[PDB]
């Protein structure tokens, strides 16, 4: 996934996503249905 597309899906770019707590990342993954 391109960073822009990732930001489209999750709201944040991969780097900023990885910066987040793992439970929050997982929550986001499950929220958008994209792991």
How is this structure best described in words?
This protein is mostly helical and 35 residues long. It has helices spanning 3-10, 14-19, 22-32. It has one domain (3-32): Orthogonal Bundle (Villin Headpiece Domain, Chain A). The chain is built from three helices and no strands. The longest helix is centred in the last third of the chain and has 11 residues, at 22-32.
The CATH homologous superfamily corresponds to: Villin headpiece domain
* Terminal-residue CA separation: 11 Å
The count of helical stretches stands at 3
Q: Radius of gyration over alpha carbons?
A: 9 Å
Q: Report the β-strand fraction as a percent range.
A: under 5%
Helix content: over 70%
Number of strands: 0
Structural class: mainly alpha
Number of domains: 1
What is the fold named in CATH at topology level?
Answer: Villin Headpiece Domain, Chain A
Order of helices and strands: HHH
Shape: globular
CATH architecture: Orthogonal Bundle
Subcellular location: Cytoplasm, Cytoskeleton; Cell projection, Microvillus; Cell projection, Lamellipodium; Cell projection, Ruffle
Family: Belongs to the villin/gelsolin family.
Protein name: Villin-1
Organism: Gallus gallus
Secondary structure blueprint with pairings:
Elements (H helix, E strand, L loop, with lengths): L2 H8 L3 H6 L2 H11 L3
